[PDB]
Protein backbone atom coordinates (compact mmCIF):
# COMPACT_ATOMS: atom_id res chain seq x y z
CA UNK A 1 0.00 0.00 0.00
CA UNK A 2 1.09 3.50 -0.93
CA UNK A 3 0.67 6.22 1.69
CA UNK A 4 -2.27 7.61 -0.28
CA UNK A 5 -3.80 4.14 -0.56
CA UNK A 6 -3.68 3.34 3.15
CA UNK A 7 -5.05 6.72 4.17
CA UNK A 8 -7.88 6.34 1.68
CA UNK A 9 -8.55 2.81 2.93
CA UNK A 10 -8.99 4.04 6.50
CA UNK A 11 -11.14 6.91 5.24
CA UNK A 12 -13.35 4.52 3.32
CA UNK A 13 -13.99 1.87 5.94
CA UNK A 14 -14.12 4.13 8.98
CA UNK A 15 -16.11 7.00 7.42
CA UNK A 16 -17.76 6.28 4.09
CA UNK A 17 -19.30 2.85 4.76
CA UNK A 18 -20.82 3.43 8.26
CA UNK A 19 -22.16 6.89 7.51
CA UNK A 20 -23.77 5.84 4.24
CA UNK A 21 -24.88 2.45 5.57
CA UNK A 22 -25.94 3.42 9.12
CA UNK A 23 -23.96 0.51 10.57
CA UNK A 24 -25.70 -2.12 8.45
CA UNK A 25 -22.54 -4.00 7.48
CA UNK A 26 -21.11 -7.22 8.87
CA UNK A 27 -17.74 -8.89 8.81
CA UNK A 28 -17.28 -12.02 6.77
CA UNK A 29 -15.00 -15.02 6.61
CA UNK A 30 -14.47 -17.69 3.94
CA UNK A 31 -13.13 -21.20 3.48
CA UNK A 32 -11.66 -20.66 0.03
CA UNK A 33 -10.46 -24.28 0.17
CA UNK A 34 -13.87 -25.87 0.57
CA UNK A 35 -15.32 -23.12 -1.63
CA UNK A 36 -13.27 -23.94 -4.72
CA UNK A 37 -13.25 -27.66 -4.00
CA UNK A 38 -17.03 -27.59 -4.03
CA UNK A 39 -17.59 -25.29 -7.00
CA UNK A 40 -14.63 -26.26 -9.16
CA UNK A 41 -12.66 -29.54 -9.36
CA UNK A 42 -15.54 -30.91 -11.41
CA UNK A 43 -15.68 -32.53 -14.81
CA UNK A 44 -15.36 -29.64 -17.38
CA UNK A 45 -12.51 -28.08 -15.44
CA UNK A 46 -10.62 -31.31 -14.71
CA UNK A 47 -11.20 -33.25 -17.94
CA UNK A 48 -8.60 -32.28 -20.59
Amino acid sequence: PSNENTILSKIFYFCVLPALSNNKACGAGVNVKELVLDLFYTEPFICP
Binding site: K33, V36, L37, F40, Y41, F45, I46, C47, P48
Partner: protein, 61 residues
Protein backbone atom coordinates in the same frame (compact mmCIF):
# COMPACT_ATOMS: atom_id res chain seq x y z
CA UNK B 1 9.49 -49.15 -10.18
CA UNK B 2 8.39 -48.07 -6.70
CA UNK B 3 8.45 -44.47 -7.92
CA UNK B 4 5.81 -45.18 -10.56
CA UNK B 5 3.55 -46.66 -7.89
CA UNK B 6 4.06 -43.51 -5.81
CA UNK B 7 3.14 -41.35 -8.81
CA UNK B 8 0.00 -43.38 -9.50
CA UNK B 9 -1.00 -43.47 -5.82
CA UNK B 10 -0.68 -39.69 -5.62
CA UNK B 11 -2.69 -39.40 -8.84
CA UNK B 12 -5.56 -41.38 -7.31
CA UNK B 13 -5.22 -39.46 -4.05
CA UNK B 14 -5.40 -36.03 -5.72
CA UNK B 15 -8.76 -36.61 -7.38
CA UNK B 16 -8.92 -40.18 -8.58
CA UNK B 17 -7.98 -38.77 -11.98
CA UNK B 18 -8.14 -41.14 -14.91
CA UNK B 19 -4.95 -42.09 -16.78
CA UNK B 20 -6.39 -40.17 -19.72
CA UNK B 21 -5.91 -37.04 -17.62
CA UNK B 22 -2.58 -38.35 -16.33
CA UNK B 23 -1.35 -38.08 -19.92
CA UNK B 24 -2.18 -34.36 -19.94
CA UNK B 25 0.94 -32.13 -20.10
CA UNK B 26 0.23 -30.19 -16.90
CA UNK B 27 -0.09 -33.54 -15.16
CA UNK B 28 2.81 -35.11 -17.05
CA UNK B 29 5.14 -32.39 -15.77
CA UNK B 30 3.86 -32.00 -12.21
CA UNK B 31 3.24 -35.60 -11.13
CA UNK B 32 7.04 -36.11 -10.75
CA UNK B 33 7.25 -33.05 -8.49
CA UNK B 34 4.23 -34.21 -6.51
CA UNK B 35 6.10 -37.49 -6.13
CA UNK B 36 8.89 -35.81 -4.16
CA UNK B 37 6.26 -34.78 -1.59
CA UNK B 38 2.99 -36.00 -0.01
CA UNK B 39 5.16 -38.54 1.72
CA UNK B 40 5.20 -35.82 4.35
CA UNK B 41 2.22 -34.83 6.48
CA UNK B 42 1.49 -31.89 4.20
CA UNK B 43 -2.08 -32.38 2.92
CA UNK B 44 -4.27 -33.87 0.24
CA UNK B 45 -6.30 -30.69 -0.36
CA UNK B 46 -3.22 -28.59 -1.11
CA UNK B 47 -2.43 -30.76 -4.12
CA UNK B 48 -5.96 -30.40 -5.47
CA UNK B 49 -5.80 -26.61 -5.22
CA UNK B 50 -2.31 -26.61 -6.73
CA UNK B 51 -3.51 -28.65 -9.69
CA UNK B 52 -6.45 -26.26 -10.01
CA UNK B 53 -4.35 -23.12 -10.20
CA UNK B 54 -1.70 -24.71 -12.42
CA UNK B 55 -4.27 -26.10 -14.86
CA UNK B 56 -5.74 -22.61 -14.86
CA UNK B 57 -2.38 -20.95 -15.59
CA UNK B 58 -1.96 -23.41 -18.45
CA UNK B 59 -5.21 -22.40 -20.18
CA UNK B 60 -4.84 -18.69 -20.91
CA UNK B 61 -6.15 -18.33 -24.46
Amino acid sequence: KEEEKKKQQMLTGVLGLQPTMANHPVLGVFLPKYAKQNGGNVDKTAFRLDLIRMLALHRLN
